[PDB]
Amino acid sequence: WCCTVLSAFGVVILSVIAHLFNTNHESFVGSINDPEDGPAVAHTVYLAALVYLVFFVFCGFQV
C-alpha cells in the first residue's frame, strides 16, 4: 500500500517533470545551474516514471 500510493504519486509527479524538461521550461532549465540538454535529462525521468509504473502495476496485483 505504501509503495502503491508512493508510485501513484511517483508516476504523476515524475512524468510532468519529464514534460517540464522535454519542453525546455523556463523554471527548470532557465538558470546557469540548470541541467543542460533538457531532452537528455528528460529520459532519465521518463525511465524513472515508468519504473514507478512498474512498481505501481506490480504492487497493484496484491490489492
Binding site: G10, S27, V41, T44, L47
Partner: protein, 734 residues
C-alpha cells in the same frame, strides 16, 4: 425548528409536575429524548439525604461488580463478543425505547450471586495454584537450598556474605519458563540458590533469613537415590494436581463463557438505570401531594416534542395523570445550545475548547468555519501541499459511512471529527498556493507575465526586468529564482498580514456591537464600543488604509518619494507632526487629529462606565487591557508572514537537497538516483511539510482565534448544554 448556529438556542425553563406513581417511568421517556438539562434543586441538602441515594448505592454496588466481572474477563482472556443489540433497540433518535420493570431487582440478586460464587471459585483455584507453584519449583532441584524471586540474588548474597563469616560456599542456578504468583499477580522470574554451612546455630539463622524474604526454602535428601525417590513422589502428586486443576479451571472458565458473551447487554441497562436515579435526585418533593418537581432547560423550539411525548406516555399509562410540564420564567442563566450538523461540528468543537459561550451570544464557531481554514491557508499556502491535504481529507469525506464505525484510534478520531476542517484547509490552501504562485516548490507559468526581461544580455550579468503589466491572479512567476525575491514577497506578505489581521479584528470586534444591541444595553455601546472603535480604527485602521493608499499611488511617475509606513507610524506618537515625507495632502492636520481623538478616547473609555464601586475597578482593568493589546495583536498577526516564509522557503530547500541533486544526463545511475531521491523527497515532504509544518500552522490559526479574535466579542463563559441523554457507554471504562 429554527437553527441555533448564529446565536445560541432560545432556552425555556420548563418544570415537571411528575407524580410519584410514574416518577421512575416517565423519567425514561425524556431521558431517551435527550433534550432537558436539569438544575440542582438540591444543592443545600446533605449529599446522602437526596431520597433516592439508597437506590443509587444499590446499583453502584452492581456496577462495582460488573467491573469485577470484566476483570475476570481480562485475567482468563475471554474475547467478550459484546452483542450490540442494546444499541439496535434504543436507537437514540425517538422515545420508542420501553422501560424495564422489576428486572433490575433480578439483576441485583443475579449480580450478587455471581460475585459470591466467583470469589469462592477464584480463591479455590488460586489456592491450588499456590501449591502448584510450590511443587513445580520443588521438582526443579529434585547445607540449605531453595528458590527466591530472582531479583533478591544481589541482596541475599549481600546479607549472607556479612552474617556467617565472609567465608562461605554459595551456588546459584536459573529457572526457565517462569511462573506467576498470588501476591504479585504477574509472571516473575525465579532463581535456585544453594548455601552451605557446618554450624548448627548458623543454619537456623540462615533458614530464618531466607524464610523472611520472598522465598520458600526446602530440604532435600543427601543421596542420589533419595533424590530419585522424592522426584517420583513429587511428580506423582503433581500429576494428580494437574488432574484436579484442569477440571476446576474448565468449570470456572466455561461458567465465565455463560456471561462473557452477554454481559455487555445487561451492563447498559444498569448504567442507564443508574443515570435516571441520579437525574431524579436533583428534584424536590411535597409532603402533602406526592409530586416531584425537576426544573430543567429545554430549547423553546422543542416544546412541541414534549407535548407529543407526554401524550404518548399518557396513552400507554392508564393513570390519566395531568403531567403538566409547564414553563415558567426565571432569573438564572440558561445554557448555550448550538445546533451543528456534520459540517459545522468540527468547527464548533475547536472554538469552545477555549470556552463555552454566553447565553445567546454571537457564536464564534460560525465565522470560524471560514476564518480558521483561511487563516491556516495564509500560512501554509501551496497547491501541492494543499492537494496532498485535500486528498488526505477527501478520502475520509468520500466514505465517511464506513469510517463512522471502525476501530476509532486516538489520532484517528481527531483526524476524522475534523475531516471538513482539513478539507476546507486544503482547498483554501490550494487557492492560496495559487495566489502565492506555488506548486510544491515552484511556480505555475500559466498567465502572461507583467514583467518583461530585456532583449539581449551576457551570460553572467545582473538583469533588471521592466513592468509591462500586472499579473491577473496571484504573484508573477517572474519572481522565481530572482535575487530579490524575498524583498518583494516579505513586504507583500507582511502588509497582507497587517491587512488581513485588521479586518479579522474588526469583523470580530463588530460582534460586540452585534450583541450589545441585542441585549438592549446602550450603556456598553457608548462606553465600550464607540470609544474602542475610534481608538482601534484610528491607530490601526489609519495604518491599514495607508498600505492600500501607498499601493494605489504610483510613486515613480509622480516624481514624489515613496514614504515609509513604519517610519510614519512611529512619529504619529513620538513628535506627532514633522513628517519626513508626506503621503497625502493635508496630512499633519489630520495625522495629529487622529492622535487627539484616540487620546480623548482613553479617558472616555474608563470614566464613562462607572459614572454612567466594583465596575470602576473592572473598567480600569479593561481599558488598559484594551489599549496595550491592540498594539500587541496587530504585531502578532506577523506570524502569518513568519510561518508562510518558513514554509515556502524551507520547502524550497527541501526540493534542492533531494530532487534537484538527482538531475543529470545519466543512464543507469540516474534512473536509480532520481527514484531514491524522490522517495527521499515525497516521504520527507509529507512528514515535515504536511504534518509537522502543517500542525504548526493550524495552531496559530487556532491561536489567532483564541486570543486575537475572541478577546473582543467573546465575553464571559456559560454552562454548557449537555442534556440528560442515553449513550452506548463502553465496558472498557472500568
Amino acid at each position: 425548528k429554527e437553527e441555533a448556529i448564529f446565536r445560541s438556542a432560545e432556552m425555556a425553563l420548563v418544570q415537571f409536575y411528575i407524580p410519584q406513581e410514574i416518577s421512575r417511568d416517565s423519567a425514561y421517556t425524556l431521558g431517551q429524548l435527550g433534550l432537558v438539562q436539569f438544575r440542582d434543586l438540591n444543592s443545600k441538602v446533605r449529599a446522602f439525604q437526596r431520597t433516592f441515594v439508597n437506590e443509587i448505592r444499590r446499583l453502584d454496588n452492581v456496577e462495582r461488580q460488573y467491573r469485577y466481572f470484566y476483570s475476570l474477563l481480562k485475567k482468563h482472556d475471554i474475547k467478550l463478543y459484546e452483542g450490540d443489540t442494546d444499541k439496535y433497540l434504543d436507537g437514540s433518535g425517538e422515545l420508542y425505547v420501553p422501560p424495564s420493570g422489576s428486572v433490575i431487582d433480578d439483576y441485583v440478586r443475579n449480580a450478587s450471586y455471581l460475585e459470591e460464587r466467583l470469589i469462592q471459585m477464584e480463591d479455590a483455584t488460586d489456592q491450588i495454584e499456590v501449591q502448584k507453584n510450590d511443587l513445580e519449583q520443588y521438582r526443579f532441584i529434585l547445607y540449605v537450598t531453595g528458590v527466591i524471586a530472582r531479583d533478591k540474588v544481589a541482596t541475599l548474597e549481600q546479607i549472607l556474605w556479612r552474617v556467617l563469616r565472609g567465608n562461605l560456599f554459595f551456588k546459584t542456578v536459573e529457572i526457565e519458563q517462569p511462573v506467576y504468583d498470588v501476591k504479585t499477580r504477574e509472571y516473575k522470574h525465579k532463581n535456585a540458590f544453594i548455601v552451605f554451612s557446618h554450624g548448627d546455630l548458623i543454619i537456623k539463622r540462615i533458614r530464618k533469613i531466607a524464610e523472611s524474604l520472598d522465598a520458600n526454602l526446602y530440604d532435600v535428601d543427601s543421596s542420589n537415590e533419595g533424590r530419585s525417590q522424592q522426584l517420583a513422589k513429587v511428580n506423582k502428586n503433581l500429576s494428580d494436581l494437574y488432574t484436579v486443576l484442569k477440571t476446576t479451571s474448565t468449570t470456572l472458565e466455561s461458567e465465565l463463557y455463560a456471561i462473557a458473551k452477554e454481559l455487555d447487554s445487561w451492563f447498559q441497562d444498569v448504567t442507564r438505570e443508574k443515570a435516571i436515579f441520579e437525574i431524579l435526585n436533583k428534584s424536590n418533593y411535597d409532603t402533602n401531594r406526592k409530586i416531584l418537581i425537576a426544573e430543567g432547560w429545554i430549547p423553546r423550539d422543542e416544546l412541541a416534542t414534549l407535548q407529543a411525548r407526554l401524550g404518548e406516555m399518557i396513552a400507554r399509562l392508564g393513570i390519566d395523570v395531568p403531567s403538566i410540564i409547564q414553563v415558567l420564567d426565571t432569573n438564572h442563566t440558561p445554557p448555550t445550545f448550538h445546533r451543528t450538523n456534520k459540517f459545522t461540528a468540527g468547527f464548533q468543537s475547536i472554538c469552545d475548547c477555549y470556552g463555552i459561550a454566553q447565553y445567546r451570544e454571537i457564536n464564534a464557531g460560525l465565522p470560524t468555519i471560514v476564518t480558521f481554514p483561511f487563516m491556516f491557508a495564509i500560512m501554509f499556502g501551496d497547491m501541492g501541499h494543499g492537494f496532498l491535504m485535500t486528498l488526505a481529507a477527501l478520502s475520509l469525506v468520500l466514505n465517511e459511512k464506513k469510517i463512522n464505525k471502525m476501530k476509532r484510534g486516538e489520532i484517528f478520531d481527531m483526524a476524522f471529527t475534523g475531516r471538513y476542517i482539513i478539507l476546507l484547509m486544503g482547498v483554501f490552501s490550494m487557492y492560496t498556493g495559487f495566489l502565492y504562485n506555488d506548486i510544491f516548490s515552484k511556480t505555475m507559468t500559466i498567465f502572461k507575465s507583467g514583467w518583461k526581461w530585456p532583449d539581449h544580455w551576457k551570460k553572467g550579468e545582473s538583469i533588471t526586468a521592466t513592468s509591462v503589466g500586472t499579473y491577473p491572479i496571484g504573484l508573477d512567476w517572474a519572481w522565481h529564482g530572482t535575487e530579490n525575491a524575498l524583498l518583494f514577497s516579505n513586504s507583500y506578505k507582511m502588509k497582507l498580514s497587517i491587512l488581513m489581521g485588521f479586518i479579522h479584528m474588526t469583523y470580530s470586534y463588530f460582534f460586540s456591537l452585534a450583541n450589545h444591541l441585542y441585549f438592549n444595553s446602550m450603556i456598553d455601546i457608548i462606553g465600550n464600543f464607540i470609544p474602542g472603535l475610534l481608538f482601534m480604527q484610528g491607530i490601526f485602521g489609519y495604518l491599514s488604509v495607508c498600505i492600500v493608499y501607498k499601493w494605489a499611488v504610483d510613486w515613480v511617475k509622480d516624481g514624489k518619494p515613496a514614504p515609509g509606513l513604519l517610519n510614519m507610524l512611529i512619529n504619529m506618537f513620538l513628535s506627532p507632526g514633522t513628517i519626513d515625507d508626506e503621503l497625502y495632502p493635508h496630512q499633519a492636520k489630520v495625522q495629529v487629529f487622529l492622535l487627539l481623538m484616540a487620546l480623548v478616547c482613553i479617558p472616555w473609555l474608563l470614566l464613562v462606565k462607572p459614572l454612567h464601586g466594583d465596575i470602576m475597578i473592572h473598567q480600569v482593568i479593561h481599558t488598559i487591557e484594551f489599549c496595550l493589546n491592540c498594539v500587541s495583536h496587530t504585531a502578532s498577526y506577523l506570524r502569518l508572514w513568519a510561518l508562510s516564509l518558513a514554509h515556502a522557503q524551507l520547502s524550497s530547500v527541501l526540493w534542492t537537497m533531494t530532487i534537484q541533486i538527482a538531475f543529470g544526463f545519466r543512464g543507469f545511475v540516474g534512473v536509480f538516483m532520481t527514484v531514491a531521491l524522490f522517495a527521499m523527497w515525497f516521504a520527507l515532504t509529507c512528514a515535515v511539510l504536511v504534518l509537522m509544518e502543517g500542525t504548526s500552522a493550524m495552531l496559530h490559526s487556532l491561536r489567532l482565534h483564541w486570543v486575537e479574535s475572541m478577546s473582543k466579542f467573546f465575553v464571559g463563559e456559560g454552562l454548557p448544554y449537555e442534556p440528560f441523554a442515553f449513550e452506548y457507554k463502553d465496558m472498557e471504562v472500568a
